[PDB]
Scaffold this active site. Structure first.
Site, PDB file in Angstrom:
ATOM      1  CG  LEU A  72     -21.465   8.524   6.288  1.00 44.79           C
ATOM      2  CD1 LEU A  72     -21.280   7.537   7.245  1.00 44.79           C
ATOM      3  CD2 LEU A  72     -21.078   9.997   7.256  1.00 44.79           C
ATOM      4  CG  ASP A  73     -16.327  11.301   3.622  1.00 46.88           C
ATOM      5  OD1 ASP A  73     -17.428  11.460   4.441  1.00 46.88           O
ATOM      6  OD2 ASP A  73     -15.488  12.061   3.861  1.00 46.88           O
ATOM      7  CB  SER A  74     -14.537   6.638  -0.089  1.00 49.92           C
ATOM      8  OG  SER A  74     -13.520   7.679  -0.356  1.00 49.92           O
TER       9      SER A  74
ATOM     10  CG  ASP B  33     -15.940  10.874   6.688  1.00 48.55           C
ATOM     11  OD1 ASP B  33     -14.664  11.304   6.757  1.00 48.55           O
ATOM     12  OD2 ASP B  33     -16.662  11.750   6.896  1.00 48.55           O
TER      13      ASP B  33
END
Ligand SMILES: CCCCCCCCCCCCCCCCCC(=O)OC[C@H](COP(=O)(O)OCCN)OC(=O)CCCCCCCCCCCCCCCCC
Ligand SMILES: CCCCCCCCCCCCCCCCCC(=O)OC[C@H](COP(=O)(O)OCCN)OC(=O)CCCCCCCCCCCCCCCCC
Ligand SMILES: C[C@H](CCC(=O)O)[C@H]1CC[C@H]2[C@@H]3[C@H](O)C[C@@H]4C[C@H](O)CC[C@]4(C)[C@H]3C[C@H](O)[C@]12C
Ligand SMILES: *C(=O)CCCCCCCCCCCCC
Lengths: 547, 88, 120, 171, 81, 70, 128, 459, 63
Positions: B42-44, B46
Site C-alpha cells: 500500500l501507499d501513504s 492509501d
C-alpha cells in the site's frame, strides 16, 4: 385564610429544609439525591393546595412577616406577595422541576459531585420562587441576583472546560448589565417616590414614569437574553443538559418579562416603553429565528429555538396584554424543557455526540424518544388545542387586531413560520432518515427512572396547558371578534412553515454539489453579533485598561 | 451512560475488521503485524483513508503527525489502546 | 390593511383619524338616539372587583359568568353557557364599534362631494 | 518547515470533513468524496515540484470560501462537546503523598507496590542522567526525541508522569 | 462481552444506492474504495423508515379508529338523554 | 445494571424490548386523540368563533347616515 | 472572487495562505532548527526538575519573573519633557475629568434654580 | 473607655512574661476575650451619644469601627505565627508588642473626644505600621517611596496641625461636643479655601484618593500579611472617621470645593477596576480593588446626605472584613508557592476543596451580593447620588459591572482551571488556615441579619 | 478538609445548643412582660422600660 396563607409559605421554607441538612450533620449519605426530589414532590402538593383556594377565592395575599430594617421613613421586610402569578407560576415551575428532578438523578450518575450538583439545583429553585413572590424591589432584587449567581456555578459546573469559564462570565457580564436598570428603578422610586413596596408604587400611579420603566426595559434586555444583550443565552449550552433544561429554558429566562408584568399598572399608560419593547422583541424574535434557520448544534439550536419564543413574549407585553403573555411563560416551558430532556435522550444513546448532522434513524431505534419529540414541536409550532397554540393564536389576536407599528407586525409572522421551520429540520435529522451515528451502537433507553421523568413532562403539554386555561378567572375583554384571516392567519401561515421547510429539507437529498451564500452564513454565524461583539469589546475594555 | 467498556481483545477486530471491508486488500494475506506499505503493498495516500475510517469507527480525532507512523495494525491498536488507557 | 391602505394611499381626509375618532357632532343629522342603559350601577361594579377595561356596558352580562364559576368549584365545565351571553353581548359591541366608525367615515366622504361642488 | 509534500495531506483530510458535513447523507458523502478524490487524482501523478509547489496555492485560496459555516468537530478533540469536560475531575498522582494515614489504611496493598514504582523512579534516576550524555549533541540537543533503555531492568529516562498520568475517566 | 462480530461480506452495495455511485462512477471512470464500508446505514434493520408524513402520523391509526367511537359515544350518551 | 439486560450491537438495529415500544404508541396515537376529540365540540376554535361581517354589506339607513343631499 | 481576507489585529491570517511558509529554504531551515534545539534544551533543562523526585517546590521560572518584573515599570524608563506622549498621554487621565466637571455641575446649577422656582417635581421625595 | 485600654496594655506583660511556647496562646486567648467586652459599647441612645469623660467617648458611628479593630487583633495573630515560627523568640515578642500598641492607638483614636488628641494619635498610629511593614517586609527592592510619605506630611498632616490650632484660637475649643454647638457658618474667602484644604487633604491621602494612591499598591506588595490586614481594615478607615466628624464645620464651603474630589472618585472607580483585570498579582489586584471601594465612600461623605453616611459606615465595615479576608485567603496560597503572581498557580480547586469554598464565598460578597452588607451600604450610596445628580448612575453601574468582572476573574483564574503540573507542594488545608477565613466570612453575613448596628449615627 | 467541619460544627454547638434552650425555657415560663400604666409616684429603674427578659436583664447588669 389562615390555612391558605399558612400552607402557602411552607413551600419556600419546606424546599429549604434539605439545604439546611447539607451544611449540618452526616446522618445519611447516598440518599440526598432522592431526598430533594421527594421534597419537591411533597412541595408540589403543598403548591396545589393554594391552587384550589386561589381559584375559588382569588385571594391575592401580601404577607409582611417581619420588620427587617427602617430608615427615616422606609421599612424593609422578608415579605411575600401571594397573588395570581405566584399561585399559578409556582405550580408549573415545580412541575417542570419535578420532571427535571428525576431526569438529573440519572443523567449525572457520572459525577462524583452529584450530591453537590443538587446542593445548587435546590438553591436556584428557592431564589426563583422568592423572586416571583417578592413584594418589594429589594427582596425582588435579591432573587434577581440569586438566579444570576446560582446560574454562574451551574453554568460552569465543569470548571475545567474553557467554554464554561468564558460562557459563564459572558452571561454574568450581561446579567450584571441588566441590573443597571434595576438599581436605577429603585433610585427613581426612591427619589421621586419614597418606597420600594409595590403597594405605594401602583397606588400613586406615577405621571412621568419613563425613566423607571426604561430601567425595567434594560433589565429584561440581558436577563431574558433579548437582542442587544442576547448572545449569552445560547452560550449556556456548553455545560450540563439538565442544567440548561431548568435555568435557561423555564425558570431564569422568564425573569426579564416577569418584571414588566409585575408592574402592569404603570406600564399601560406610557407607550414609549411599549414601542421599544414591542420593537425589541420584533428585532429579537426574528433575529433569533433568522439566525436559527441554519444553525447546526442540537443544544444551541434549542437555545435559539427558545430564544425566539422569549423574543416574542416581549411583543406580547409590547401589545399591552398583561395576563395573556403570562400564559406563554408556562406553556412554552413544558415541552421545551422536555425537548432539553429529549435532547438528553439523544445525547445519551449517542454517547456524547451533539451535531444535528450526526443523528438519524431514530423513529424505531429510539421509540420513546420519538414519542414526545413531535408533541413539543407541534405544540411549539402551534398545533391546535395544544399547550403552545393557545398563546400563539390568542397572542396574535391583539397585535394584528389592535394599534401596532407597521414594521412590528412585519417580522411578527415572518419568524412565526420560521418557528416550525427548524423544528422540521430537527425532527428530520433527529428522527427521519436512516441512522448516521458512529459505527458502534450505544442506544439504550430502557431506564424506568427517565421514563418516569419523561412520563411526567410528556403529559403536561398535552393536557395541563388545556386545563390551565379553564380555571383562571376573567381579567380581560378577549378580542373574540376579528377578520377571519386575522383570526386564522396563524392557522394559515402555520402549515406554511412545515411545508416551506419541507420544501427546503427534501431538495437537499439530491446528489448535487453545494454553493456558499452570504446569508447562509450571516444567519448561521449568528449575524456576526457574537463573533464580533465578543472580541473587540473585551479588547477595548482590557487592551485599553493599562493606559 | 451505564458503562461503555473497552477491551483489547474486543477492540482487536474493530481495528482489523475496518480493513476487512477494504477494496484494495486481500483479507487473508493481511496479518496482525503486517506492515501496510510492504507486506500489504500500500501507499501513504492509501494509508490516509484507513486512518480516517478509525475516526468514524470509534469516534475520536487523530493527529496528523502520529497518524502516518501507524503502519502496523498493532500500532493502531496501541494508539487506540494507549490513548484511552485500555490495557486488558 | 384595506382601511389602512385606502386612507393614506387614497385620500387622507375621507377617513376619520382613528385616535381622534369620534370627531364630528353626535347630532349631525342623527335624531332621537336612545340612551344606552347600565344594568349594574356604580355600586355593583365596585363590589365586582373587575378591571376597568373589563368594565363596560356589556360587563353587566360579565357579572353572570363568574357567579356560577365560584360555586362551580372544583369543576369548571358548569358555567360554559353563561359565557356566551356576555361574549355574544361583547360580540355585538365589536360590530357596534365597527358601526360607530362608519357614521364618522360616511360624513367625511359625503362632505367631500358637497364641498367639491361648492367651489368647482 | 514540514515540506509541501506532507502539506498536501493537511488539506486532503481536512477538506473532506467540511465536505463531509456538507454531504450529510451517506450516499452523497461517498459519491461527493469520490468527486473530490477524483480531482486529487487529476494531479496526483503530477511530479513537477514547481507545479506541485504551485498546485497548492489555489487549493488553499479555493477552500476558504468553501469552508463550513459550522464545521463539525469530534467530541473529545479540541473544541468538541467533551473537550476537557472531565479535566475538573482528573487528579494529580503526586498528591498521593499528602494522604492522611487513616485514609491510606483503606488501600494497604496498592500503596505497597507504589513504593517499588517510586523505587525505580529513584535508583534508576542516576544512570538515566548519563544515559542521555552519549546521545547528547553539543549546542543543545537537536530534538526532543528520547531513546529507550539499552539494558534490562531500567526504563527510558523522563517517563515518570506519563506512565503515572491519570486515566481518561476518573469516574 | 464476547460481542460476536458477524460476517464481513454481509455489507454490500447490491440493491442499495451505494452502488448507484458505482453505476455513475463508470462515467466517472473510478470506483468507491470503501463500497462495503457504509452498507449498514441502509442495512441491518434500517431499510424502511417513515418519512415526515409518517412521523406526524405515528400511531394515528389506533387513535383514529378509537376517535370515531368516542365522538359517536356522545350521540350514544346524548340521544338517550 | 441487572447484568447487561441490553447487549449492544455493531452496525445494527438496537436490541430493544417490546415494553418500551408499547407505551410509545399510546401517547403518540393519543396525541391526535385530544386534537380531534375536541375539534368536534371545539370546532369554532380552529374555524372561527363567530363570523366576521364584511363591511361593504352595510347601509346608510342602518347607520342613519343622511345622503349627500340630506 | 475569493477576496483575500484583510489581515487585522483581531483576525490572524490562515496558516496555508501566507507566502512565507510555502517555500522552506535555508533562510527558513536554519531558523526553524535553531529554535527547536533551543526549545529542546529548555525542555531538557526543565525535564530534569520535572522528573526528579528530589524537588519539593515550585520551579522559579526565569521567563515569568521578567514578565512580572517588566509590568512594574515605575521611573526607570521615560523622560519628563517627552512631548510625544507626556502631553497627549497625560490627557488620557486628565481630559475626561473636566468633562464631568460641567456635566454634573450644569445639572445641579440647573436643578437648584428650578427648586428656587419650583420648576422641578419633588412632592413625594424624601430620601436625599 | 479605660476598661478596654488597660487590658489591652496588660497583653504586653502577657506577651513578655509568658512562657516560651505559650506566647501565641496567651495573647490569642485574652485578645479574643477582650473583644467580647467590646460588644458592650453598643449601648447607644437615640438622641445623645455616649460621653464617658473628657478624654474618650464613642457615639453610634465610632463603635462599629472599634469592634472591628478589637475583633481584628486576634485574627492578625493567627495568620502571623506560620511565617514567624522560624523567627527567634525575642523578635516575635517585639512584633506582637507593636500590634498591641497599634490596637491601643486605634481604639483610643476613634474614641477620642478632642480633635487634637485625635490628631496626635492619628500620627502615632502610623509609627507601628512603618516598623511592621519595613522591619518584616516581604521585599528588598528599595523602591525609595519616602517622597509619598514626605508628601503626606507636606500636603497632609502638617497643614492639618495649623488649621486645628487656628480653629481653637478662633472658635475657642476643639471638643467635638462643643463644636456641635459653637459651629459657625464658614463664609467664602481665600483664607478659608486654604483652611478647607488643611482639614481634608490630610485624610484624603489615607483613604486613599485616586491619583494620590501610589503608595497603597506598593505598600501591600511589601507589607506582610499581619501588616496588610490592619492597613486596609483599619488604617484606611481613619480618614472617613475624621472627615465625617471634621466636615461638621466646613459648611457651606464644601458645597463647591467637593467637586474636584467627587470627580476624582466618580471616574477613579472605573480606572482602578479596569486595571485590576490587567494586574499580575493577587495582592496588587486587591490593592486597587481596595481603592475602588474606598472611592465610593469619599463621594458619600462630601455630599453629606442622611443616606450617604448610613451607607458609608457599612462600606468601610464590609470592605474591611472583605479585603482583610481576601489578603488572608490570597496569603493562604503564599504559604505554599511563596509567590504573589496570580498565574503561577491555577486550578487549585482540584487540590484545595474547602479553600475554594472560601474563595467563592468571599468573592460573592466582594461584588456586593444581596442582601449582604457589602451591598446594603453600596446600594445605599448609589441611591443618594441620584438626588445629588441623576447622571451618576452611569459610573456606579459601570463600576459595579467591572467590579463584578474582575472579582470573579481572580476566582476563575486560580480555582476554576487546570492544575499546574510541576507544582508538588499543595498540601491539604490546615486547621489554622480554614479557621482564619471562617471567622471572617461568618460575622460578615450575620450583620446582614441585624443591620441596625452598622447603620451609622443617622439611624 | 472533612475534619475542620468537625470542629466548626461542634464548637458552635458546644454552647449554641443551650442558647436556644435557655431562651426557650425562659420564654415558656417567664415569657415576656405586658405594658402597664404609670401609677403616680412610681419611678421605675432604667431597666424597667423593656419587655423581653434578656433585654430587660442586659440593661441592669451592663448598660
Ligand atoms: C502658604 C500660605 C498658606 C496660607 C495661610 C494664610 O494665608 O492664612 C491666612 C489667615 C490669617 O488670618 P487670621 O488672622 O488667622 O484670621 C482672619 C482670616 N480672615 O489664616 C487663617 O485665618 C487660617 C489659617 C489656617 C491654616 C492654613 C493652612 C495652610 C495650608 C493651606 C493650603 C493647603 C493646601 C493643601 C495641598 C493641596 C494640594 C492639592
Ligand atoms: C435563671 C434565673 C432565674 C431567676 C428567677 O428566679 O426569676 C426569673 C428572672 C426574672 O427577673 P426580671 O423580671 O428580669 O427582673 C425583676 C423584675 N422586677 O429572670 C430574669 O431576670 C431574666 C434573666 C435573663 C438572663 C439569663 C438568660 C440568658 C441566657 C444566659 C445563659 C448564661
Ligand atoms: C430522623 C431520621 C433518622 C432515622 C434513622 O435512624 O435512620 C432522619 C435521618 C435520615 C433522614 C431521611 C433521609 O434523609 C432520606 C429519607 C428517604 C427519602 O429521601 C425521604 C426523606 C427521608 C425519609 C429522610 C427523613 C428524615 O429526615 C430522616 C429519616
Ligand atoms: C392589511 O393589514 C391586510 C391586507 C389585506 C387587505 C384586504 C384588501 C382586499 C379585501 C378588502 C375588502 C374586504 C375587507 C377585508
Amino acid at each position: 385564610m389562615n390555612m391558605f396563607s399558612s400552607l402557602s409559605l411552607v413551600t419556600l421554607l419546606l424546599l429549604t429544609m434539605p439545604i439546611m441538612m447539607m451544611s449540618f450533620n452526616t446522618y445519611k449519605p447516598s440518599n440526598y439525591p432522592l431526598y430533594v426530589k421527594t421534597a419537591i414532590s411533597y412541595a408540589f402538593i403543598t403548591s396545589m393546595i393554594p391552587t384550589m383556594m386561589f381559584i375559588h377565592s382569588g385571594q391575592e395575599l401580601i404577607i409582611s412577616n417581619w420588620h427587617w430594617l427602617t430608615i427615616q421613613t422606609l421599612k424593609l421586610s422578608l415579605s411575600f406577595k401571594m397573588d395570581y402569578f405566584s399561585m399559578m407560576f409556582i405550580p408549573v415551575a415545580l412541575f417542570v422541576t419535578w420532571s427535571i428532578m428525576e431526569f438529573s438523578m440519572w443523567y449525572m450518575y457520572s459525577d462524583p459531585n452529584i450530591n453537590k450538583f443538587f446542593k445548587y439545583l435546590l438553591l436556584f429553585l428557592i431564589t426563583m420562587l422568592i423572586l416571583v413572590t417578592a413584594n418589594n424591589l429589594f427582596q425582588l432584587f435579591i432573587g434577581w441576583e440569586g438566579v444570576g449567581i446560582m446560574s454562574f456555578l451551574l453554568i460552569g459546573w465543569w470548571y475545567g472546560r474553557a467554554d464554561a469559564n468564558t460562557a459563564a462570565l459572558q452571561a454574568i457580564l450581561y446579567n450584571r448589565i441588566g441590573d443597571i436598570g434595576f438599581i436605577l428603578a429603585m433610585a427613581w422610586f426612591l427619589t421621586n417616590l419614597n418606597t420600594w413596596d409595590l403597594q405605594q408604587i401602583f397606588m400613586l400611579n406615577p405621571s412621568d414614569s419613563n425613566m423607571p420603566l426604561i430601567g425595567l426595559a434594560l433589565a429584561a434586555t440581558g436577563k431574558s437574553a433579548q437582542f442587544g444583550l442576547h448572545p449569552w443565552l445560547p452560550s449556556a449550552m456548553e455545560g450540563p443538559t439538565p442544567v440548561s433544561a431548568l435555568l435557561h429554558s423555564s425558570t431564569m429566562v422568564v425573569a426579564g418579562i416577569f418584571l414588566l408584568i409585575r408592574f402592569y399598572p404603570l406600564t399601560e399608560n406610557n407607550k414609549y416603553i411599549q414601542s421599544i419593547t414591542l420593537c425589541l422583541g420584533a428585532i429579537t424574535t426574528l433575529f433569533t429565528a433568522m439566525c436559527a434557520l441554519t444553525q447546526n448544534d442540537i443544544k444551541k439550536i434549542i437555545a435559539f429555538s427558545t430564544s425566539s419564543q422569549l423574543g416574542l413574549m416581549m411583543v406580547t407585553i409590547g401589545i399591552n396584554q398583561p395576563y395573556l403573555a403570562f400564559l406563554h411563560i408556562c406553556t412554552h416551558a413544558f415541552f421545551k424543557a422536555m425537548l432539553f430532556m429529549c435532547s438528553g435522550s439523544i445525547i445519551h444513546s449517542l454517547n456524547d455526540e451533539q451535531d444535528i448532522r450526526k443523528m438519524g434513524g431514530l423513529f424505531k431505534a429510539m421509540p420513546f424518544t420519538t414519542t414526545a419529540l413531535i408533541v413539543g414541536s407541534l405544540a411549539l409550532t402551534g398545533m391546535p388545542f395544544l399547550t403552545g397554540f393557545y398563546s400563539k393564536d390568542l397572542i396574535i389576536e391583539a397585535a394584528n387586531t389592535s394599534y401596532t407599528n407597521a414594521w412590528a407586525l412585519l417580522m411578527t409572522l415572518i419568524a412565526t413560520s420560521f418557528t416550525a421551520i427548524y423544528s422540521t429540520r430537527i425532527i428530520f435529522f433527529a428522527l427521519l432518515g436512516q441512522p448516521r451515528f458512529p459505527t458502534l451502537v450505544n442506544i439504550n433507553e430502557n431506564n424506568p427512572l427517565l421514563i418516569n421523568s419523561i412520563k411526567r413532562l410528556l403529559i403536561g403539554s398535552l393536557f395541563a396547558g388545556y386545563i390551565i386555561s379553564n380555571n383562571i378567572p376573567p381579567t380581560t375583554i378577549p378580542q373574540m371578534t376579528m377578520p377571519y384571516y386575522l383570526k386564522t392567519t396563524a392557522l394559515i401561515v402555520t402549515i406554511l412553515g412545515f411545508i416551506l421547510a419541507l420544501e427546503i429539507s427534501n431538495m437537499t437529498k439530491n446528489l448535487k454539489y453545494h454553493y456558499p451564500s452570504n446569508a447562509f452564513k450571516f444567519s448561521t454565524l449568528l449575524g456576526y453579533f457574537p463573533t464580533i461583539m465578543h472580541r473587540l469589546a473585551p479588547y477595548m475594555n482590557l487592551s485599553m485598561s493599562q493606559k | 451512560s451505564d458503562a461503555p467498556p473497552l477491551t483489547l481483545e474486543g477492540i482487536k477486530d474493530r481495528v482489523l475488521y475496518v480493513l476487512k471491508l477494504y477494496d484494495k486488500i486481500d483479507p487473508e494475506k493481511l496479518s496482525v503485524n503486517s506492515h501496510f506499505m510492504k507486506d500489504l503493498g500500500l501507499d501513504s495516500l492509501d494509508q490516509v483513508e484507513i486512518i480516517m475510517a478509525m475516526e468514524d469507527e470509534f469516534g475520536f480525532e487523530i493527529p496528523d503527525i502520529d497518524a502516518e507512523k501507524l503502519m502496523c495494525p498493532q500500532e493502531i491498536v496501541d494508539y487506540i489502546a494507549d490513548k484511552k488507557d485500555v490495557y486488558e | 390593511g384595506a382601511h389602512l391602505a385606502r386612507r393614506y394611499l387614497g385620500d387622507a381626509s375621507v377617513e376619520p383619524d382613528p385616535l381622534r375618532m369620534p370627531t364630528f357632532p353626535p347630532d349631525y343629522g342623527f335624531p332621537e338616539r336612545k340612551e344606552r342603559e347600565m344594568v349594574a350601577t356604580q355600586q355593583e361594579m365596585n363590589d365586582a372587583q373587575l378591571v376597568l377595561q373589563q368594565r363596560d356596558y356589556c360587563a353587566h352580562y360579565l357579572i353572570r359568568f363568574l357567579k356560577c364559576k365560584r360555586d362551580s368549584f372544583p369543576n369548571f365545565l358548569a358555567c360554559k353557557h353563561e359565557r356566551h351571553d356576555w361574549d355574544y353581548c361583547e360580540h355585538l359591541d365589536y360590530v357596534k364599534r365597527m358601526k360607530e366608525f362608519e357614521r364618522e367615515r360616511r360624513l367625511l366622504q359625503r362632505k367631500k362631494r358637497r364641498e367639491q361642488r361648492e367651489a368647482d | 518547515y514540514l515540506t509541501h509534500q506532507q502539506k498536501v495531506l493537511r488539506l486532503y483530510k481536512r477538506a473532506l470533513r467540511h465536505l463531509e458535513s456538507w454531504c450529510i447523507h451517506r450516499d452523497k458523502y461517498r459519491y461527493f468524496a469520490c468527486l473530490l478524490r477524483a480531482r486529487f487524482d487529476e494531479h496526483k501523478n503530477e511530479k513537477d515540484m514547481v507545479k506541485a509547489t504551485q498546485l497548492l496555492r489555489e487549493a488553499e485560496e479555493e477552500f476558504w470560501h468553501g469552508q463550513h459555516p459550522q464545521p463539525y468537530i469530534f467530541p473529545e478533540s479540541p473544541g468538541g462537546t467533551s473537550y476537557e469536560r472531565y479535566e475538573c475531575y482528573k487528579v494529580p498522582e503526586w498528591c498521593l503523598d499528602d494522604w492522611h494515614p487513616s485514609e491510606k489504611a483503606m488501600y494497604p496493598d496498592y500503596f505497597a507496590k507504589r513504593e517499588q514504582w517510586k523505587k525505580l523512579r529513584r535508583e534508576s534516576w542516576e544512570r538515566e542522567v548519563k544515559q542521555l550524555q552519549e546521545e547528547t549533541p553539543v549546542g543543545g540537543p537537536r530534538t526532543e526525541a528520547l531513546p529507550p533503555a539499552r539494558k534490562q531492568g531500567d526504563l527510558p529516562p523522563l517517563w515518570w508522569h506519563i506512565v503515572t498520568r491519570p486515566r481518561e475517566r476518573p469516574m | 462481552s464476547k460481542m460476536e462480530l458477524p460476517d464481513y461480506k454481509q455489507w454490500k452495495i447490491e440493491g442499495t444506492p451505494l452502488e448507484t455511485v458505482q453505476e455513475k462512477l463508470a462515467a466517472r471512470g473510478l470506483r468507491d474504495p470503501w463500497g462495503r464500508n457504509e452498507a449498514w446505514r441502509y442495512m441491518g434493520g434500517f431499510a424502511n423508515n417513515v418519512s415526515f408524513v409518517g412521523a406526524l402520523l405515528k400511531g394515528f391509526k389506533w387513535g383514529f379508529a378509537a376517535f370515531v367511537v368516542a365522538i359517536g359515544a356522545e350521540y350514544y350518551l346524548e340521544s338517550q338523554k | 445494571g441487572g447484568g447487561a439486560h441490553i447487549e449492544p450491537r455493531y452496525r445494527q438495529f438496537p436490541q430493544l424490548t417490546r415494553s418500551q415500544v408499547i407505551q410509545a404508541e399510546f401517547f403518540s396515537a393519543t396525541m391526535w386523540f385530544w386534537i380531534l376529540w375536541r375539534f368536534w365540540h371545539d370546532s369554532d376554535a380552529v374555524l372561527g368563533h363567530f363570523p366576521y361581517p364584511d363591511p361593504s354589506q352595510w347601509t346608510d339607513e342602518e347607520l342613519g347616515i343622511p345622503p349627500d343631499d340630506e | 472572487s475569493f477576496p483575500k481576507y484583510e489581515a487585522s489585529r483581531l483576525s490572524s491570517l490562515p496558516t496555508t495562505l501566507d507566502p512565507a511558509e510555502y517555500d522552506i529554504s535555508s533562510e527558513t531551515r536554519k531558523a526553524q532548527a535553531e529554535r527547536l534545539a533551543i526549545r529542546s534544551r529548555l525542555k531538557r533543562e526543565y525535564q530534569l526538575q520535572y522528573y526528579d523526585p528530589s524537588r519539593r517546590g515550585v520551579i522559579e521560572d526565569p521567563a515569568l519573573v521578567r514578565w512580572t518584573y517588566a509590568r512594574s515599570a515605575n521611573i526607570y524608563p521615560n523622560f519628563r519633557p517627552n512631548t510625544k506622549t507626556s502631553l497627549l498621554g497625560a490627557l488620557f487621565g486628565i481630559g475626561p475629568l473636566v468633562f464631568w466637571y460641567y456635566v454634573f455641575k450644569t445639572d445641579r446649577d440647573r436643578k437648584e434654580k428650578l427648586i428656587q422656582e419650583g420648576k422641578l417635581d419633588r412632592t413625594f421625595n424624601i430620601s436625599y | 473607655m479605660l476598661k478596654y485600654i488597660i487590658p489591652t496594655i496588660m497583653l504586653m506583660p502577657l506577651t513578655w512574661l509568658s512562657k516560651n511556647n505559650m506566647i501565641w496562646v496567651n495573647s490569642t486567648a485574652h485578645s479574643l476575650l477582650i473583644s467580647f467586652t467590646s460588644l458592650l459599647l453598643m449601648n447607644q441612645f437615640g438622641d445623645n451619644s455616649l460621653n464617658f469623660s473628657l478624654l474618650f467617648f464613642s457615639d453610634s458611628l465610632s463603635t462599629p469601627l472599634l469592634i472591628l479593630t478589637m475583633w481584628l487583633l486576634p485574627l492578625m495573630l493567627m495568620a502571623s505565627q506560620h511565617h514567624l515560627s522560624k523567627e527567634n523568640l525575642t523578635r516575635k515578642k517585639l512584633f506582637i508588642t507593636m500590634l498591641i500598641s497599634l490596637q491601643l492607638f486605634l481604639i483610643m483614636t476613634f474614641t477620642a473626644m478632642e480633635l487634637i488628641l485625635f490628631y496626635i494619635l492619628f500620627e502615632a498610629t502610623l509609627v507601628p505600621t512603618l516598623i511592621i511593614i519595613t522591619r518584616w517586609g516581604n521585599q528588598t527592592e528599595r523602591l525609595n517611596a519616602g517622597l509619598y510619605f514626605l508628601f503626606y506630611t507636606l500636603a497632609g498632616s502638617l497643614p492639618l496641625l495649623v488649621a486645628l490650632i487656628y480653629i481653637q484660637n478662633t472658635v475657642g475649643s476643639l471638643n467635638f461636643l462643643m463644636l456641635q454647638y459653637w459651629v459657625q457658618p464658614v463664609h467664602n474667602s481665600w483664607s478659608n479655601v486654604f483652611m478647607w484644604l488643611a482639614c481634608m487633604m490630610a485624610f484624603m491621602v489615607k483613604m486613599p484618593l485616586y491619583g494620590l494612591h501610589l503608595w497603597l499598591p506598593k505598600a501591600h506588595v511589601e507589607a506582610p500579611i499581619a501588616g496588610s490586614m490592619v492597613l486596609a481594615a483599619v488604617l484606611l478607615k481613619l480618614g472617613g472617621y475624621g472627615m465625617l466628624r471634621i466636615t461638621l464645620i466646613l459648611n457651606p464651603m464644601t458645597d463647591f470645593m467637593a467637586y474636584p474630589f467627587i470627580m476624582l472618585s466618580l471616574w477613579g472607580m472605573i480606572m482602578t477596576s479596569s486595571i485590576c483585570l490587567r494586574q499580575t498579582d493577587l495582592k496588587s489586584l486587591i490593592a486597587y480593588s481596595s481603592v475602588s471601594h474606598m472611592a465610593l465612600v469619599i463621594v458619600a461623605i462630601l455630599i453629606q446626605t442622611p443616606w450617604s453616611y448610613m451607607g458609608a459606615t457599612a462600606l468601610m465595615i464590609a470592605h474591611g472584613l472583605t479585603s482583610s479576608m481576601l489578603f488572608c485567603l490570597a496569603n493562604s496560597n503564599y504559604e505554599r508557592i511563596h509567590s504573589r503572581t496570580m498565574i503561577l498557580a491555577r486550578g487549585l480547586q482540584t487540590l484545595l476543596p474547602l479553600m475554594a469554598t472560601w474563595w467563592l464565598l468571599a468573592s460573592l460578597t466582594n461584588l456586593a451580593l444581596p442582601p449582604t452588607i457589602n451591598l446594603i451600604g453600596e446600594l445605599f450610596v448609589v441611591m443618594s447620588t441620584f438626588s445629588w445628580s441623576n447622571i451618576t448612575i452611569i459610573l456606579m453601574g459601570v463600576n459595579m459591572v467591572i467590579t463584578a468582572l474582575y472579582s470573579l476573574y481572580m476566582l476563575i483564574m486560580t480555582q476554576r482551571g487546570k492544575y499546574t503540573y510541576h507544582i508538588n507542594n499543595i498540601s491539604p488545608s490546615f486547621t489554622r488556615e480554614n479557621a482564619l477565613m471562617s471567622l471572617h466570612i461568618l460575622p460578615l453575613l450575620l450583620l446582614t441579619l441585624n443591620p441596625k448596628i452598622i447603620l451609622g449615627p443617622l439611624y | 478538609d472533612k475534619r475542620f467541619l468537625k470542629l466548626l460544627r461542634f464548637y458552635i454547638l458546644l454552647t449554641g445548643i443551650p442558647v436556644a434552650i435557655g431562651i426557650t425555657l425562659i420564654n415558656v415560663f417567664i415569657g415576656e412582660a405586658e405594658l402597664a400604666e404609670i401609677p403616680e409616684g412610681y419611678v421605675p429603674e432604667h431597666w424597667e422600660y423593656f419587655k423581653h427578659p434578656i433585654s430587660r436583664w442586659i440593661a441592669r447588669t451592663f448598660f
